């Protein structure tokens, strides 16, 4: 029980630390999608024109 | 969109040319109509019988 708790502590800290840096990666993908969304808006309005 | 605008704008030039070209027939038809009445009226005076 103590080994699992100690082992889970490293996993929780590692998962939390890894998930923290992963948030920047997910935000980067969202930023690229938002940047690409600008082209869609320009293309959508372009088709309307 | 620019191609459609250029095609639409270019189409206006053809319509303007048609209106300008057709305008000559309108003025020419009016001039011919006046001359037709003169020739028709003068013809009846020479010998309407």
């Amino acid at each position: 029980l103590d080994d699992l708790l100690v082992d889970l502590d490293h996993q929780r800290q590692s998962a939390c630390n890894l998930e923290k840096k992963q948030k920047k990666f997910d935000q980067l993908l969202a930023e690229e999608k938002t940047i690409s969304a600008k082209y869609a808006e320009e293309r959508d309005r372009a088709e309307a024109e | 969109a620019r191609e459609k605008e250029t095609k639409a704008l270019s189409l206006a030039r053809a319509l303007e040319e048609a209106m300008e070209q057709k305008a000559e027939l309108e003025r020419l038809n009016k001039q011919f109509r006046t001359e037709m009445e003169d020739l028709m009226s003068s013809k009846d005076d020479v010998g309407k019988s």
Side-chain angles (χ1 to χ4, degrees), chain A residues 40-49, chain B residues 1 4:
Chain A
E41 295 149 42
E42 301 315 314
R43 187 263 299 163
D44 289 332
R45 273 179 273 98
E47 281 173 15
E49 279 299 319
Chain B
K4 302 322 185 71

Side-chain angles (χ1 to χ4, degrees), chain B residues 30-41:
Chain B
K30 288 173 179 179
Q31 296 153 228
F32 269 69
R33 284 161 186 153
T34 53
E35 295 176 352
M36 184 69 198
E37 293 152 46
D38 179 44
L39 288 172
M40 184 65 204
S41 53

Side-chain angles (χ1 to χ4, degrees), chain B residues 16 19 24 35:
Chain B
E16 291 145 22
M19 188 267 288
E24 307 312 313
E35 295 176 352

